[PDB]
């Protein structure tokens, strides 16, 4: 009854369209004093340039288990959660 419920779960996730981010893409989780926390970016690498909305970059300093910690190469005050 385990395999059945496993595939039941996989059917029901699709029925509700819950799905992952694409690799090389993510969302800003939190913003403070120019430090940025990003969820996703499963293919980001240490020291990479992450392109933000607008025409600016953040530098990936930490690859945490659940997030990427990055610092903004410019003004940060216009950034927002969910970009």
């Amino acid at each position: 009854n385990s395999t059945e419920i496993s595939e039941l779960i996989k059917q029901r996730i699709a029925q509700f369209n819950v799905v992952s981010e694409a690799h090389n893409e993510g969302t800003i989780v939190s913003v403070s004093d120019g430090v940025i926390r990003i969820h996703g970016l499963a293919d980001a690498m240490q020291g990479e340039m992450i392109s933000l909305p607008g025409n600016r970059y953040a530098i990936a300093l930490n690859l945490e288990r659940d997030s990427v910690g990055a610092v903004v190469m410019g003004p940060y005050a216009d950034l927002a959660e969910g970009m």
């Binding site: 939190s30 913003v31 403070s32 926390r37 005050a77 950034l79 927002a80 959660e81 969910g82």
Partner: protein
């Protein structure tokens, strides 16, 4: 329409929760009805989950959890120009003398990039 609600009040620090899709940006200005007077809050940090953390531009006493919060989408804006001459104002650009309203022509945001 107010869209946020106060969720913590720890001294001057007020945390407000908004819908996931409408978190105010850093340095934006919020306002709440502290009883019978408006209190302005300035955004310092965007925490995860739609929560934002602010510093109260006024007395924090009397605030409850669950009060409605209005998101003014600009930073703190102050009157400027010739009308300001000879007038005393507070940080919010409100007259602290008794001499009536300031005949403003423009209001500028106080947060700016240098030339």
């Amino acid at each position: 329409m107010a869209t946020g609600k106060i969720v913590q009040v720890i001294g001057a620090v007020v945390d407000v929760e908004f819908p996931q899709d409408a978190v105010p940006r850093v340095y934006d200005a919020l306002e709440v009805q502290n009883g019978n007077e408006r209190l302005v809050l300035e955004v310092q940090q965007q925490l995860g989950g739609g929560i934002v953390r602010t510093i109260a531009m006024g007395s924090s006493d009397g605030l409850r959890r669950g009060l409605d919060v209005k998101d003014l989408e600009h930073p703190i804006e102050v009157p400027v120009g010739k009308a300001t001459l000879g007038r005393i104002m507070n940080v919010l650009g409100e007259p602290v003398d008794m001499k009536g309203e300031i005949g403003e022509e423009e209001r500028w945001a106080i947060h700016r990039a240098a030339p």
